[PDB]
Design a protein that fits this description.
The complex is a heterodimer of chains A (about 120) and B (about 120).
Chain A: H1 3-9, E1 29-35, E2 38-39, E3 49-56, E4 61-65, E5 78-81, E6 94-95
Parallel strand pairs in A: 4-6
Antiparallel strand pairs in A: 1-3, 1-5, 2-3, 3-4
Chain B: E1 6-8, E2 17-19, E3 38-41, E4 56-59, E5 68-69, E6 75-76, E7 85-86
Antiparallel strand pairs in B: 1-2, 3-4, 4-7, 5-6
Chain A binds 4 RNA strands through loops.
Chain lengths: ~120, ~120
Amino acid sequence: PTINQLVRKGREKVRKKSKVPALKGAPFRRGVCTVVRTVTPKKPNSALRKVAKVRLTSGYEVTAYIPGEGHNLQEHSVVLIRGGRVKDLPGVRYHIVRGVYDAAGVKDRKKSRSKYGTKKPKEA
Amino acid sequence: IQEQTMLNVADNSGARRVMCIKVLGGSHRRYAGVGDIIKITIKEAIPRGKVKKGDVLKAVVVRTKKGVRRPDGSVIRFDGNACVLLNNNSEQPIGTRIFGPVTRELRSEKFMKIISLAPEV
RNA sequence: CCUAACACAUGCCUCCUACGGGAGGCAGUGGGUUGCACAAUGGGCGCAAGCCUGAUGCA
RNA sequence: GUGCCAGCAGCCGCGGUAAUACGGAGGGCGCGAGCGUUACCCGGAUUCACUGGGCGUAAA
RNA sequence: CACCGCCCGUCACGCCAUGGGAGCGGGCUCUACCCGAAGUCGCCGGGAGCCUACGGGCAGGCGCCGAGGGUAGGGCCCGUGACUGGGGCGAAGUCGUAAC
RNA sequence: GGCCGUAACUAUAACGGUCUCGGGUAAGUUCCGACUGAUACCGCCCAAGAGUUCAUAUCGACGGCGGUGUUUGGAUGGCUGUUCGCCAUCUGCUCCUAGUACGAGAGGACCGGAGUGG
């Protein structure tokens, strides 16, 4: 654009668009499960990912992924969503914190336990 | 007081006009003023409240132009038309307070909540 | 307390009524540490002494 | 041990009977009254390029 | 898995998803007219009151402004929504065979 | 213009072949947006069955006999022209008896009386 044009119209600042309406731009948001179904992967993957519809305290009701070997998530089980997409499950923008609320941590975890809310295995 | 007839709320949660659609007391009660029970129907209401719009309930009659007299014969006529809805089948006057004056006959035994409010008569 | 400028017992709409009529910061409670002190600095008042001071100095 | 299951997963991916990628164990690496996670900001990003970018066929 | 290949559209089913929108309700930003508290202020304050050193003061009265309320219309975007549209992918749905 | 087969749960079938829902309403069929007695009705007769058991508390198969004159015949409102229908919404209530009799509780009389209503 000409300098004169810039002066007239000028540049337009870019607007970032949140990819996690965990509303109130919170770091985490807790809600309640509606359904603990299972979903099939996308384009080139196969498996039965464990998922859950969640009624947020933020008013929203979204689909969150359940990380880990095996959960203990039911219905009216209170849980904490944390935001994190999952390339294979579209419509799934958050992971479910394991080790918080009704989401029991992964049993028999010995590695990245922190990312699975499982205490330090008392080694004898 | 005969069907139709616009009656105002004198208590709360469902403002203004309220439609009387019946008169109990039995077969052919034409009217019912003073302080009788009357099947009502909310038609306006404030956006808020726990009683929306068009909720077929019953209610009482507080201030009615037809007047009320007794004794001596003197009369207290209030030019208005007071309802004051009551939570329907577990009968009782729903609400918190009552507005304006009330009637001394309204103090009828079994009622009583309503008259310890609306500081008047 | 980054949320609820949400509602607040006690000490520093809700409640009472004789239905006529009335009353409504510090620490803590519910909902989504109720600590010590005038010693010091500063302030109010005082002729000063000193009194007040959940500022504040401390724990 | 399990056998495209159960599961891992930040990205690429790993698991369909020899899996250093799942689960445990032995051993090891790193930190240590901490360690790990999530969230957000800057970085990496000369990927808004003033420093310091470009437009024949890649976006232009 | 290479012409016994590939492949398109209608309609139908599957995992999934969703827009437009008349009105109805509510909010923001208001217009017009009617009612209008407290209070300051303005005028009266009189053989209508109280006080007076007769100068005046107070009570009281009226009035403007005025929080707010009322009837009609408009704005906000949030809600619901009979009405209507309907898209991405799909191994062995249906009718054809458009394309390569 | 017809008839037939057909894709991922069905349903539909692009393909192949072949000759009621929403709105307004408390409620909206409107509105707006998508002589005779066959027959009938009413009664009775028999009693296989059902009713845990037990035909007849209640009902009653297979069949049977009649009576009537009546069908087919020879309380305010919403909707509608409706009748009808669907939908909204003299005697009551209360108290005493007595929260007693009865009842596991839940609940709740008789008889008799008293007041106030449509």
